Paper text:
EF-Tu brings aminoacylated transfer RNAs (aa-tRNAs) to the ribosome. The N-terminal domain (G domain) is a guanosine triphosphatase (GTPase) that is followed by two β-barrel domains, important for aa-tRNA binding. G-domain proteins generally function as molecular switches by alternating between inactive GDP-bound and active GTP-bound states. We provide structural and biophysical evidence that phosphorylation of EF-Tu at T382 acts as an efficient switch that turns off protein synthesis by decoupling nucleotide binding from the EF-Tu conformational cycle.
On the basis of our structural observations on the link between the switch I region and phosphorylation of T382 at the β-barrel II domain, it is tempting to predict that posttranslational changes in EF-Tu, perturbing the switch I region β-hairpin conformation, would be an effective way of trapping the protein in an open conformational state. T61 from the switch I region is another major phosphorylation site observed across bacterial proteomes. Therefore, we hypothesized that during translational arrest caused by T61 phosphorylation, the underlying molecular mechanism would again be decoupling of nucleotide binding from the EF-Tu conformational dynamics and trapping EF-Tu in an open conformational state. To test this, we produced the T61E mutant to mimic E. coli EF-Tu phosphorylated at T61 (EF-TuT61E). In addition, the phosphomimic EF-TuT61E was significantly less dynamic than the wild-type protein. Using the phosphomimetic T61E mutant, we showed that the effect of phosphorylation is again to trap pEF-TuT61 in an open inactive state or at least shift the dynamic equilibrium toward a dominant nonfunctional state. In this case, the phosphate group of pT61 interacts with K56, thereby stabilizing the β-hairpin conformation of switch I. As is the case of pT382, phosphorylation of T61 would lead to major clashes in the closed conformation of pEF-TuT61, indicating that it is incompatible with the closed active state. EF-Tu is highly conserved in bacteria, including the key phosphorylation sites T61 and T382 (8, 18, 19).
Author numbering: 9 to 393
The structure:
């Protein structure tokens, strides 16, 4: 029915993220129905588990007349880091909360940096605690500082919606301040475009298995990740080996002959021309010229602490783990930042990875770092080199 959008509040400690998350739920419920959530209920965030990594995060849900929002608010800076790198749902947009009394702070910069790194596509800013500021020239100064900050990290600072308000006075009931929270909900709907449906994205099928039907040819199996493959359409086999071009000669679902295969369907794609021996672990079927194979990439990664089931010892320059992209582990070489000799468990770093085999890759692709068969960390492709 109504579109679902994943948002969240980012910004420095005590700028007003939780108060704002409360005010959003409260004002939207007071204006056009729903259940209002108190500050206390969002503040003491429960602990969530993302494959062994522990993250304190509050998941609040609210509705505007057209959209349904799944909103994340975390207590500490460490949770934001973990959540942006491996968190359950990738943000479609973010609300950057900036206290007009403090202006941009170290975590303001960090969240903006991580946001682009991790591929958060839209940022709306709520200039909080304006009830405390009597100087209009001061508000303009903070606003200009925030727009400069966003532009520094490739966000369109000059075109970013900035709402001047007070999250506390709005949670309190003050109509004049409650208007500004409605203006913010308006920007969520107008500035963040409708999220792209999996079925409307270019066709991609990560290859889970290969078989060869007698007389029909090679069958490649998997769950259609995105788009639609119709019988007769041209396809590319991208991964370890040099990219191959073929044609979908059939689509099968447990004996049922389909004319097409859509996103979320477990399907068997027939390829006339391709031989079984040409298909390798980690290959992908995709709409020709929509994905490129790469070996070298820049990534933002988090290494599990011993407590999270990860290693107890640090790793060094010579570390060569397995990178689990979609279907298989691929061994990679690591380049640590200038001056970094070792990486401790529980740390996050910028890692330049060189895979032994190319992998169909785009910025924003998430992966797992495994040493045995055990997860030692998680990452996101920031830049494809
Ligand atoms: N003056 C003023 N203080 C506010 C406002 N919103 C929140 N605060 C207060 O600032 C403190 C920090 O708020 P909080 O949401 O917990 O910050 P967070 O850690 O960034 O989420 C709390 O004691 C709030 O009541 C506001 O609009 N104006
Ligand atoms: Mg908070």
């Amino acid at each position: 029915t109504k579109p679902h959008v994943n948002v969240g509040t980012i910004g420095h400690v005590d700028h007003g993220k939780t108060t704002l998350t409360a005010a959003i739920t409260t004002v939207l419920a007071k204006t056009y129905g729903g259940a209002a959530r108190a500050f206390d209920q969002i503040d003491n965030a429960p602990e969530e588990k993302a494959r062994g990594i522990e993250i304190n995060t509050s998941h609040v849900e609210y509705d505007t007349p057209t959209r349904h929002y799944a909103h994340v608010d975390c207590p500490g800076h460490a949770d934001y880091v973990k959540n942006m790198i491996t968190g359950a749902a990738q943000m479609d947009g973010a609300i950057l909360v900036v206290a007009a009394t403090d202006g941009p702070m170290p975590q303001t910069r960090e969240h903006i940096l991580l946001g682009r790194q991790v591929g958060v596509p839209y940022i709306i800013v709520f200039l909080n605690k304006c009830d405390m500021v009597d100087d209009e020239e001061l508000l303009e100064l903070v606003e200009m500082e925030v727009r400069e900050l966003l532009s520094q990290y490739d966000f369109p600072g000059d075109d970013t919606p900035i709402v001047r308000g007070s999250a506390l006075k709005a949670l309190e009931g003050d109509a004049e301040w409650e208007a500004k929270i409605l203006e913010l909900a308006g920007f969520l709907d107008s500035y963040i475009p409708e999220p792209e449906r999996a079925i409307d994205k270019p066709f991609l099928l990560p290859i889970e298995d290969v078989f060869s039907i007698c007389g029909r040819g090679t069958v490649v199996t998997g769950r259609v990740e995105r788009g639609i493959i119709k019988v007769g359409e041209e396809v590319e086999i991208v991964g370890i080996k040099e990219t191959q071009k073929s044609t979908c000669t059939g689509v099968e679902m447990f004996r049922k002959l389909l004319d097409e295969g859509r996103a979320g369907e477990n399907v068997g794609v027939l390829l006339r021309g391709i031989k079984r021996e040409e298909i390798e672990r980690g290959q992908v079927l995709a709409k020709p010229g929509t994905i490129k194979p790469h070996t070298k990439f820049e990534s933002e990664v988090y290494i599990l602490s011993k407590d999270e089931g990860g290693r107890h010892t640090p790793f060094f320059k010579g570390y060569r783990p397995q990178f689990y992209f979609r279907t298989t582990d691929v061994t990679g070489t690591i380049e640590l930042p200038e001056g970094v000799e070792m990486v401790m468990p529980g740390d996050n770093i910028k890692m330049v990875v060189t895979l032994i085999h190319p992998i169909a890759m785009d910025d924003g692709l998430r992966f797992a770092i495994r040493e045995g068969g055990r997860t030692v960390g998680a990452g996101v492709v920031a830049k494809v080199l």
